[PDB]
Amino acid sequence: ADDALAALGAQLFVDPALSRNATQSCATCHDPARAFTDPREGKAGLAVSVGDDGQSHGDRNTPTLGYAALVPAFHRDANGKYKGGQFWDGRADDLKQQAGQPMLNPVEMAMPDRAAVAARLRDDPAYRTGFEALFGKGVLDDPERAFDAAAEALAAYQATGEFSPFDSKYDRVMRGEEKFTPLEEFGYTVFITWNCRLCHMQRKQGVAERETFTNFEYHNIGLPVNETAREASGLGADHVDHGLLARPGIEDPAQSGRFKVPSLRNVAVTGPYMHNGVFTDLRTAILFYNKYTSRRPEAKINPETGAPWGEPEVARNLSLAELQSGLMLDDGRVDALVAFLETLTDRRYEPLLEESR
Amino acid sequence: ADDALAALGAQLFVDPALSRNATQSCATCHDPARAFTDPREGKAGLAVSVGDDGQSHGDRNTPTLGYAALVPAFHRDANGKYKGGQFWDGRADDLKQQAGQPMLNPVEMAMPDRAAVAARLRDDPAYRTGFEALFGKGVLDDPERAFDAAAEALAAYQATGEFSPFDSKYDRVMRGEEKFTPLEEFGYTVFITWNCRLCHMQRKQGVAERETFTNFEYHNIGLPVNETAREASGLGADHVDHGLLARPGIEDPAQSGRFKVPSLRNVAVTGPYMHNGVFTDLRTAILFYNKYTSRRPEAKINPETGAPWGEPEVARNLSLAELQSGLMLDDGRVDALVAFLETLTDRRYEPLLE
Amino acid sequence: TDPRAKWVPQDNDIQACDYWRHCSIDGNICDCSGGSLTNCPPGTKLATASWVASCYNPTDGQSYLIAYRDCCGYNVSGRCPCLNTEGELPVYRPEFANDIIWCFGAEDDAMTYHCTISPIVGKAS
Amino acid sequence: TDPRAKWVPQDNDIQACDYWRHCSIDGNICDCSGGSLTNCPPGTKLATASWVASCYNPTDGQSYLIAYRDCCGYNVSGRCPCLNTEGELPVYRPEFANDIIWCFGAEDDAMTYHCTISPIVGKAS
Amino acid sequence: QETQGQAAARAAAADLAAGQDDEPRILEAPAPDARRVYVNDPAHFAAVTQQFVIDGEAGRVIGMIDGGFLPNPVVADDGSFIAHASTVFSRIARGERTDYVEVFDPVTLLPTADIELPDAPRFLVGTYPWMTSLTPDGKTLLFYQFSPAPAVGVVDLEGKAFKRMLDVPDCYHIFPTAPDTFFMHCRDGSLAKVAFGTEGTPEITHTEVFHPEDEFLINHPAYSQKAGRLVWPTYTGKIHQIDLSSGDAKFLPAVEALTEAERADGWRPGGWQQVAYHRALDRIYLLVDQRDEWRHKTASRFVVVLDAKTGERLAKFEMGHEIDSINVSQDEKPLLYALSTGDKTLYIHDAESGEELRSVNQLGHGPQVITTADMG
Amino acid sequence: QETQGQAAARAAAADLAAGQDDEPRILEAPAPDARRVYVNDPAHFAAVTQQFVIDGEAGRVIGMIDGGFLPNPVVADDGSFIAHASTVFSRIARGERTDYVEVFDPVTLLPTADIELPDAPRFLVGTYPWMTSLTPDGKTLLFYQFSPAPAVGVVDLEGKAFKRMLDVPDCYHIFPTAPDTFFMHCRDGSLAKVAFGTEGTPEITHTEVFHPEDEFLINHPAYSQKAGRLVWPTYTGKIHQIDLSSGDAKFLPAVEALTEAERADGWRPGGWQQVAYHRALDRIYLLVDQRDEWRHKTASRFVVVLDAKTGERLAKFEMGHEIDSINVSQDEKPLLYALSTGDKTLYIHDAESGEELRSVNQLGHGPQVITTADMG
Numbered sequence A: 001a002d003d004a005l006a007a008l009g010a011q012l013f014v015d016p017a018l019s020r021n022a023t024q025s026c027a028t029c030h031d032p033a034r035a036f037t038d039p040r041e042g043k044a045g046l047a048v049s050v051g052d053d054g055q056s057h058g059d060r061n062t063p064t065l066g067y068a069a070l071v072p073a074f075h076r077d078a079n080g081k082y083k084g085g086q087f088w089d090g091r092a093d094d095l096k097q098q099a100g101q102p103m104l105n106p107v108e109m110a111m112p113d114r115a116a117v118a119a120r121l122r123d124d125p126a127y128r129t130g131f132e133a134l135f136g137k138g139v140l141d142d143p144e145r146a147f148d149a150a151a152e153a154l155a156a157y158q159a160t161g162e163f164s165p166f167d168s169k170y171d172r173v174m175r176g177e178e179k180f181t182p183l184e185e186f187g188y189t190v191f192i193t194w195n196c197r198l199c200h201m202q203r204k205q206g207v208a209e210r211e212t213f214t215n216f217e218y219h220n221i222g223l224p225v226n227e228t229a230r231e232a233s234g235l236g237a238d239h240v241d242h243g244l245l246a247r248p249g250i251e252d253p254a255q256s257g258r259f260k261v262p263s264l265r266n267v268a269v270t271g272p273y274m275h276n277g278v279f280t281d282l283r284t285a286i287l288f289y290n291k292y293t294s295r296r297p298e299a300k301i302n303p304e305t306g307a308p309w310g311e312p313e314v315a316r317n318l319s320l321a322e323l324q325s326g327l328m329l330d331d332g333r334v335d336a337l338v339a340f341l342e343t344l345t346d347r348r349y350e351p352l353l354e355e356s357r
Numbered sequence B: 001a002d003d004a005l006a007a008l009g010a011q012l013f014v015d016p017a018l019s020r021n022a023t024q025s026c027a028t029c030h031d032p033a034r035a036f037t038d039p040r041e042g043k044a045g046l047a048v049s050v051g052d053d054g055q056s057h058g059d060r061n062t063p064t065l066g067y068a069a070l071v072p073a074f075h076r077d078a079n080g081k082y083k084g085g086q087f088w089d090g091r092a093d094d095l096k097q098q099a100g101q102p103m104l105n106p107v108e109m110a111m112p113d114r115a116a117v118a119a120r121l122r123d124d125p126a127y128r129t130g131f132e133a134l135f136g137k138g139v140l141d142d143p144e145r146a147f148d149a150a151a152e153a154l155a156a157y158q159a160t161g162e163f164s165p166f167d168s169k170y171d172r173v174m175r176g177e178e179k180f181t182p183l184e185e186f187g188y189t190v191f192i193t194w195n196c197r198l199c200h201m202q203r204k205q206g207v208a209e210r211e212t213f214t215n216f217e218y219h220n221i222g223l224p225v226n227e228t229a230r231e232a233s234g235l236g237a238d239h240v241d242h243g244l245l246a247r248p249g250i251e252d253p254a255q256s257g258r259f260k261v262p263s264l265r266n267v268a269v270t271g272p273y274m275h276n277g278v279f280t281d282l283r284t285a286i287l288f289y290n291k292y293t294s295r296r297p298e299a300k301i302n303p304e305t306g307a308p309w310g311e312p313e314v315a316r317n318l319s320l321a322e323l324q325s326g327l328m329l330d331d332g333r334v335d336a337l338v339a340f341l342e343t344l345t346d347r348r349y350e351p352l353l354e
Numbered sequence C, D: 001t002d003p004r005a006k007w008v009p010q011d012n013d014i015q016a017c018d019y020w021r022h023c024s025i026d027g028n029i030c031d032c033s034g035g036s037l038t039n040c041p042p043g044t045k046l047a048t049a050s051w052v053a054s055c056y057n058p059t060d061g062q063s064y065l066i067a068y069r070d071c072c073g074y075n076v077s078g079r080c081p082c083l084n085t086e087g088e089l090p091v092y093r094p095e096f097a098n099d100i101i102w103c104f105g106a107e108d109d110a111m112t113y114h115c116t117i118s119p120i121v122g123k124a125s
Numbered sequence E, F: 001q002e003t004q005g006q007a008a009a010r011a012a013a014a015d016l017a018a019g020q021d022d023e024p025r026i027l028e029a030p031a032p033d034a035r036r037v038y039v040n041d042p043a044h045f046a047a048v049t050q051q052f053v054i055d056g057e058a059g060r061v062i063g064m065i066d067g068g069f070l071p072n073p074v075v076a077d078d079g080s081f082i083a084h085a086s087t088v089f090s091r092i093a094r095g096e097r098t099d100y101v102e103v104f105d106p107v108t109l110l111p112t113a114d115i116e117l118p119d120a121p122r123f124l125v126g127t128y129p130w131m132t133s134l135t136p137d138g139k140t141l142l143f144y145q146f147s148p149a150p151a152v153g154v155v156d157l158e159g160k161a162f163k164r165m166l167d168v169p170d171c172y173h174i175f176p177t178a179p180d181t182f183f184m185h186c187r188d189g190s191l192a193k194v195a196f197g198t199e200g201t202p203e204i205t206h207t208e209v210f211h212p213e214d215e216f217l218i219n220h221p222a223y224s225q226k227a228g229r230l231v232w233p234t235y236t237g238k239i240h241q242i243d244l245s246s247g248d249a250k251f252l253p254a255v256e257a258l259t260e261a262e263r264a265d266g267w268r269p270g271g272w273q274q275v276a277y278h279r280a281l282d283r284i285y286l287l288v289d290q291r292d293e294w295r296h297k298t299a300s301r302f303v304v305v306l307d308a309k310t311g312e313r314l315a316k317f318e319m320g321h322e323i324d325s326i327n328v329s330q331d332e333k334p335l336l337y338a339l340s341t342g343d344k345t346l347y348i349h350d351a352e353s354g355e356e357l358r359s360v361n362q363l364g365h366g367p368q369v370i371t372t373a374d375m376g
């Protein structure tokens, strides 16, 4: 049951037959060899992914599916902070509500509708067997049921130990099985004493049982537009990615430009970074934060382009109170954080850590 | 000897033969019946006195001679403040140097010269015997010796207990012989805790042996010209009384407009007040010190005139640090002060208080 | 009470200088001026910087990372002063140095020292 | 050292609260902050206002008027604090009142209280 | 018996054990209530000072407010704000003086107004609660000025502006009776009634002299603005009661706090705030001990409580500590607050019985003034 | 034998008897000398603080200087002036911050300069002497800034103006050695030499690492500017001596202030200013006591005096009080100054015998820092 449903999702996950032209599965964009992110080059490098039509580019970077199972369903907490959900703008409530979206998205897998997806499933005798044993006879004949059933199988598959093994050096260090290097231990200390802990730690205080390095909140850190991605996506030179405000039901103008805080697990191997894939290097993503803190001119320069970071896409509702910590990260502390963030890489991707350091 | 000297001075003091027309003696202006000041009405009221000649008026108020013998000889002290001397601008060093100046002043006694003074002394058999017994035979033949010996007799006379009897109600209270009235004691308290005691006390601290309510210093308290007195003086509308700066040898501009802190003894009976008799009432004099402290409209007005006090004759070197105390005297304290001042009247002038 | 004796943490009174979470506090316990173990008093501004320490919790036998944080913008409370230095390192290792006025990121640029809070932020390693 | 007992003036130590001239002093003895019995410490500004008291001198059995003068424009010294109240009247009798900060007339409009001197201004009565 | 700190350790242990998360933040003070008490520490004339906001019930500090040199605290009886007239200098104790009024939100303690007072006009003196006062409608703050002469400043808290100074005669203290009226105490032993409109000299009316030259009235009378009752002890414990509830001064029967034998044996009031008045209970509280005539500012070990009507002693408490100031909550079953400058501690007593309930120590350097709101 | 207040009573008595008159006035402090000592009181982080100017020979307070929040005192070695970098806010501890440097005349104690520091650039930390420092010619004041990053501010005391901030590596403290050069201690365990002009990137040079990552160097090293000797104890009483007199760091041999048996028996340094250095005697004084290793800021009761050259112990003094900070006069037959933050008292010892000679008490609320001028 919990075994079988996941097993069926394992199969759907790698099945390109869920795309219009049968070129693309979840695995194509969310590649298990790359911590469930897209190794493919498109017109905006690795910043955005190309759909089943071989031509359409999305407008946001493909996020890891590792540890996405730990994110709570979307909600507004009592302090009026929105939390949780899936997609960078929280517009899906949870894994299951998210799973059908790639399938119907003409920019992604591009099936025309539920009926077309059902007809695909119905063609494979193994799905008729697998789906019917879990959901009942004729499930594959009801396109709504079939589509919901697939979403649920795929959500269950992402909740297995294999998406979230907690077997990074950090996990091993938190068990006492090993120690951090001096560089990593200092990086860890910085992380917990600087402003990063205000956003990239499950809890405000106390100890998380399964830390995934995000509070699941939404913050506008004042990222510029990724021009080449935005051009590839075709959304227009006047388009504004409103972040969370794009979630249907969110009306509050103070939510414009806020994106879900991402889990920093596997961050070392899931470049490029931010919701639009704007920065290539991990160090760049960390150096961004100095722009709120440092008085040095270099702090306002994106080291990857040599030009200013850029005007924020949405110049309002910046998280200035967390961002403007009054303290700049020197290069010792940036190296220390890079070393720390690398300890967050799952055991199986430890070998990818070499071709980036 | 000190006795006979004083007794000689006593004769000279009321002798009008030391004036040009023989119409005037020291006692004429320093009337012993008026605490040694001038009862006589002139062009400018009692602000200034008339000389021997009948028309010449001074430009200063004739001060009391009581307690003047307690003033130290003129000197600059180690902290740089001039102290002591005689006249309102301290231009005389002591009582001896002062004595002769009225005799020779044309706007006062108007003797031509020391010779004419000696000649007048030679006419009186009583003077030949008096002077000769103290300064030796022929003293009156020599005008320098005569005039100086007359000045010595005058000075000795003014140094007698008669000019400084210390018998005011103030002195009797300090000797435990009587009490102040509640108001007098309030006045005394006010006097010693407010700025007055910064200038009108012999000492900065401790107990003075013969207090005369002056520290003998020179201060410009910013007084306006007495317009009628100045016009009567005939010294002109252009004239500036520079106070201490006028003493020969004082060259320091910080002293312009500074006058000697009078002793407050007998102050109740020697009006009008200040170096130029500008204020007729004692009360007015006390209120003047509110111009520096009170915010109220009433404080800018001379109550005697109903008009603003006027610009200081010398608009610099005001003793601002002492005068801008931060505190205004209310009616209650101004009353208290009058009461206290009145207790500084000598016994024999107690009758003069109305 | 022997100031020189090894510090003995207790888990039963947060207002005493031997409360286990105060093992590297310097200043005043915010609970004593209107705050709480982990909140600032009214009118003061909560800093975002902190210094840490690993404090042994004698209730559970576990050591915890305590990230101190100052309540800023008021004169020093003067109540419940305490100074501990367990694992406290000199100023050149400022993430463990506690003489520094950790008021950075406080609202209104508040930098005056009022008192300090002792929230846990991790398990120690 | 019994604070309600009648005050016992001594003439042997000016830094003590029972020194005879301090019979209506309120604040701090200027002599303990670099002044002397009758002079202000450096940096302070001497006020022209005073409150007066008559203080019994055990040594000559005479009573002296003491006009207290404040030395102003510094935070209070904290040294040799003394509060005595011989003949001290309420505020509406300010000449004898000593809660008042007697700094009127001080240079630079200095009004903050640092300490108080005790000069004699005359014999009492 | 468990202390506030120990309960706090247990809640904290349990949250950690339950894995309960909570956000570090700025607390709000609990809503103002009858049991709130404010201790002002003038700090023996230090150039800056503190006010302690205390929950009287719990014996807990719930906030603090900083002030400058000898600030005058005021508390709106209705509990809607607190304020003070305070004084700072550009270089600690020296340089440019700014006198100002600040109004505070009584739960966030944030300032809601900051009103400059022109020309440095505050009276700088050991804190007398009634040298600055709120009018009944909380719309106006009146502060006393001594220099150059007695005067009273009129501060509009509604428009957040200073208005003008009122010229007065030789008088002291300010007891507001109305939006435009307050009484002061004069050197001649009269009270003065001051009625200020918007413009011109106010209109000043003296009462009859109500005490002699040599009856001496303390610097800290109790005054209940809501009850119109000015309670005024003299050095010997003679207590003048003036009723001002009509708009004009009605003099009550003068009463005595110690007995002729106590007075004979050297019982005298003494301390700072020597007297409290409970409005509903109609009850005077007075700090006394055995003392010399001129030890009238020293701490007392005993409190006497008398009926305001009759003048009968209702209790005598041995406070068990050196007490300089007292006050009471204005609720029924009131606390009696006993502040020791020396111990820097507020001892909170049951006012009916005098037993020590709890205390708050470490209240500054030399705390002196206790204030409470009269909220009902 | 006779105390200072007894000598004063006697002499006033005699002045009174002789009718001796004196003008009440503002005293001048006696000329600064070798035995003048300054005690700064950080007042446990109060927003306002005091320095006490003390004649160590008489043990007499001769002056005070007010300051704001955690000021850094400096004293020119030649006695010509004293100064501090200080911080004030517009509303006591809140509002607009103004950092500034004041220079004072050492006799009148009057400020002769008030130099604003723009953009509130001061490092707010418990007072470390060597976080604000005079260049040797007295013309420049250098102050450390931590936020947003380590920097040093350059203040021109002769022209009375702020000059600039200098960017530095991850380093701490400022030991000036020249009008335009200072050293800092870096996180990586080296010293950095900073040489700076009116404009341009400072020349920054690192020495070699002189201590392992696990040897901890205290926040209060002694630095004699005239000897260029930086005396840096570690937590264990291991002393680093760095000779900077050639203008470059030369590493002297380490000495152990405590013996191995003493260290085996838990002796370690502890307190605030744990170490002093007498230049003329080339002697190190360390505060030491038996203590657990993490009680390194507690007071100590013993001073060991060791020859800086050989490491030989010359004395171990039982101080007889809880001492947080020591310093010595730099004259022949030096005083050892032993300040108790607990007792708020400066104890003055003969540095040779360790004998206590006199003491000055009531030095504020939490006095911590002793500064002497080196005038020889």
Ligand code: HEC
Residues within 6 Å of the ligand: A013, A024, A025, A026, A027, A028, A029, A030, A049, A050, A051, A052, A058, A060, A061, A062, A063, A064, A065, A068, A085, A086, A087, A088, A089, A095, A098, A099, A100, A102, A103, A107, A108, A109, A154, A155
């Ligand atoms: C490339 C065209 C993709 C394929 C095929 C699939 N996904 Fe995807 N995924 C893609 C992008 C570009 C994004 C972010 C877009 C945005 O609007 O934010 C995503 C996001 C998800 C998420 C949410 C993760 C998070 O918020 O952290 C999940 C759970 C997810 N993707 C899973 C998923 C499944 C189950 C798929 C096949 C059915 C699948 N993806 C296909 C890009 C692409």
Ligand code: HEC
Residues within 6 Å of the ligand: A194, A195, A196, A197, A198, A199, A200, A218, A219, A220, A221, A223, A258, A259, A260, A261, A262, A263, A264, A267, A270, A272, A273, A274, A275, A276, A282, A285, A286, A289, A319, A322, A323, A337
């Ligand atoms: C809330 C104010 C935050 C603070 C403080 C920090 N981070 Fe952050 N981070 C935050 C958000 C909302 C996002 C996504 C922003 C977007 O719109 O895309 C991020 C992203 C990162 C990343 C990239 C992660 C990824 O793309 O998968 C890194 C490496 C990262 N953050 C690190 C980081 C560090 C090291 C910080 C302290 C210096 C830090 N963040 C502060 C929210 C916030």
Ligand code: HEC
Residues within 6 Å of the ligand: B013, B024, B025, B026, B027, B028, B029, B030, B049, B050, B051, B052, B058, B060, B061, B062, B063, B064, B065, B068, B085, B086, B087, B088, B089, B095, B098, B099, B100, B102, B103, B107, B108, B109, B154
């Ligand atoms: C009216 C014409 C006078 C006659 C006759 C005498 N004096 Fe006089 N006296 C007079 C005035 C206007 C002044 C002050 C003038 C000035 O320049 O300030 C004086 C002053 C003195 C003083 C000094 C008093 C003091 O400073 O307190 C002395 C000692 C004095 N006068 C004595 C004096 C003697 C001895 C006379 C007979 C020769 C004499 N005066 C005549 C007015 C008149």
Ligand code: HEC
Residues within 6 Å of the ligand: B194, B195, B196, B197, B198, B199, B200, B218, B219, B220, B221, B223, B259, B260, B261, B262, B263, B264, B267, B270, B272, B273, B274, B275, B276, B282, B285, B286, B289, B319, B322, B323, B337
């Ligand atoms: C020095 C700064 C003084 C202070 C303060 C006070 N007084 Fe004064 N007083 C002073 C001088 C120099 C003079 C003469 C001024 C002049 O130019 O004529 C005076 C004068 C008086 C008088 C007139 C007395 C007379 O014989 O004419 C009175 C009554 C008087 N002063 C009283 C007085 C009081 C009561 C003060 C406190 C309010 C006071 N003075 C202050 C010098 C100074």
Ligand SMILES: [Ca+2]
Residues within 6 Å of the ligand: A037, A061, A062, A063, A064, A270, A271, A272, A273, A274
């Ligand atoms: Ca990515």
Ligand SMILES: [Ca+2]
Residues within 6 Å of the ligand: B037, B061, B062, B063, B270, B271, B272, B273, B274, B277
């Ligand atoms: Ca006259």
Ligand code: NA
Residues within 6 Å of the ligand: A044, A047, A226, A227, A228, A229, A278
């Ligand atoms: Na790009």
Ligand code: NA
Residues within 6 Å of the ligand: A244, A245, A246, A247, A248, A249, A250, A251
């Ligand atoms: Na929306």
Ligand code: NA
Residues within 6 Å of the ligand: B244, B245, B246, B247, B248, B249, B250, B251
């Ligand atoms: Na001249």
